Copies of this chain bind each other. A is one copy, B any other.
Amino acid sequence: HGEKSQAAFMRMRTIHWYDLSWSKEKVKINETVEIKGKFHVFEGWPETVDEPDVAFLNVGMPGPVFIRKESYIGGQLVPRSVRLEIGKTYDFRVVLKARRPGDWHVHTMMNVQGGGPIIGPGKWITVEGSMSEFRNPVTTLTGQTVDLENYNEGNTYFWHAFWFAIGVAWIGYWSRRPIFIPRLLMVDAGRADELVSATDRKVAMGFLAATILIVVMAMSSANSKYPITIPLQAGTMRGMKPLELPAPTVSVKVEDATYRVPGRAMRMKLTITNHGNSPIRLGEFYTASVRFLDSDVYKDTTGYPEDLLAEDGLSVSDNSPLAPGETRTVDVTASDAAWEVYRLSDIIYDPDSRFAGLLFFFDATGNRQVVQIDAPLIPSFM
């Protein structure tokens, strides 16, 4: 929801999300929904974004309407920040448990230490039920099961109220007598030495001694109970296992890419060389969370968000099968209302008019090839 505001070129060349899937579109309270997919870290990572040496797999959502039960990069849990390598592809999986009823736009996002939020595609997920039914049980290594919704809440309230009461008692003890104007006049007109006299000093000594003694006793009591404690577990996690993708058999060279100002279409001329041993056909162009599809070649069945999906938004001048070894140059047009709705056309405002994206090539059998393209994006006005 915070996207459509970030720079178009920055959204185009940071992280490309694809093969996204959602286990459910509509869930009950306490029910789990799983979000899977892959993200590729673009090689032309903008210099204004710090390299993803410290990155966190986050979820874009309006507060804890879901709780993040688990999150994985590769196949291992990532509750801490992780190190990503530029040019690598990683698979991810986030498990969410529904907590608050409503219709929520859930994004998978990557927060980068010195670059800010990189928001992936967002999907509307409906939660039904009551928040009062939500439970978040955890079992500790000390053998007790607690609900994270209300665990320690009473203790927190008690201690805060107790210390607030002590402070209020101190202030009220001094506030029984007149406060401001008579005391000011006594201090000014001559030596005061009369508004602070025993047993005021005795009360202050009692307050100080009781405060120190109560702090010490409470610490000792909180040590006898909960004798086993550990510090907060933190630290960036290295060694994220990237995907071992095969080298693509399709090479694409971008010769000029243009978009009309104003307009809802982006045009580029590609020289595609087909290696391997099967006829290929261009089926998809993904630029920034927006999938332009050639409906005659590929159809989306993963329930991709409709406002981000252009079913027939990709038109290839010659999308006939490309025989192996053959090289041809085609004009590719990616047109959809999403290009203006998600403010991809506002790259004219950007100080770096370069685009990046993913091309998906499909053969007759159905297996697909992912090739990455990047080029300057030249506006056209006349």
**A61 on interface, CB distance cutoff 8 Å:** no
Closest residue on chain B to residue A48 by CB atoms? B235
Contact flags A201-237 to B (C-beta < 8 A → 1, else 0): 0000000000000000000000000001011111111
Knowing A45-B238, A239-B44, the reply to whether A349 touches B381 (Cβ < 8 A) is no
Contact B233 A351, beta carbon cutoff 8 Å: yes
**How does the 8 Å CB contact mask read for A19-51 relative to B, with 1 for contact and 0 for none?**
000000000000000000000000111111000
Please tell me how many copies of the chain the complex holds.
2
- Cβ of A306 < 8 Å from any Cβ of B? no
Does A348 have its Cβ within 8 Å of any Cβ on chain B?
Answer: yes
Instruction: Give the size range of A's interface with the partner.
Output: 35 or more
- Given that A379-B141, A380-B141 are known contacts, is A352 also in contact with B45, CB under 8 Å in the complex? no
Is A353 an interface residue when CB atoms closer than 8 A count as contact?
yes
Which of B47, B141, B234, B348 has a CB less than 8 Å from the CB of A381?
A: B141
Q: Are A381 and B228 in contact (CB under 8 A)?
A: yes
Query: Which residues on B sit within 8 Å (CB–CB) of A171?
Result: none
Looking across the interface, which residue of chain B has its beta carbon closest to that of A351?
A: B231
Given contacts A141-B378, A379-B141, A382-B142, are A237 and B44 in contact (CB under 8 A)?
Answer: yes
Residue interface bits A361-382, CB-to-B below 8 A is 1, else 0: 0000000000000100011111
Q: Which of A38-68 contact B (CB under 8 A)?
A: 43-48, 54
Q: When the two chains form the complex, which single residue of B44, B83, B382 contacts A238, counting CB atoms closer than 8 Å?
A: B44
| CA–CA, A348 and B233, complex, Å | 11
A236 to chain B, nearest CB (A): 4
Quick check: A352 and B233 within 8 Å, CB to CB? Answer: yes
A379 to B351, CA, bound (A): 52
Tell me the chain A residues, 229-256 only, with Cβ under 8 Å from chain B: 230-239
Contact yes or no, A233 B353, CB < 8 A:
yes
A378 neighbours in B (Cβ, 8 Å): 141
